[PDB]
Structure 1
């Protein structure tokens, strides 16, 4: 058949790798969000207790 199969495959999986990158970035940013929350809450609680 025509070698357009080649371009189809390469573009398809070069998009799959990019979606892999996007999903890993999503996971990383979300996890950073929860870590931010946890550290902030822990520190504020710790200092507020001593203040009281």
Structure 2
């Protein structure tokens, strides 16, 4: 109550903002960036192999 409940709600808000807006956002954006890069990294090699096959043909 009063100061105690104010501290409780402040702790809840701070914890949710630190875990969601700062950390979970970091994991989500890292996951998105990995999704962008990783498979294109193999698509480039697949394109090179396809180009080599086309050159042979």
TM-score normalized with structure 2 length:
0.79
Counterparts of 1:39 and 1:9, CA distance in 2: 44
TM-score normalized with structure 1 length:
0.85
Which runs of 5 or more residues in structure 2 are unaligned? 52-57
Please tell me the root mean square deviation across aligned C-alpha atoms, in Å.
Answer: 1.0
1:45 corresponds in structure 2 to 44
Runs of 4+ in 1 over 4 A off after TM superposition: none
Counterparts of 2:45 and 2:36, CA distance in 1: 14
Q: How many residues align?
A: 50
Which runs of 5 or more residues in structure 1 are unaligned? none
Q: Who wins on radius of gyration, i.e. which is larger?
A: 2
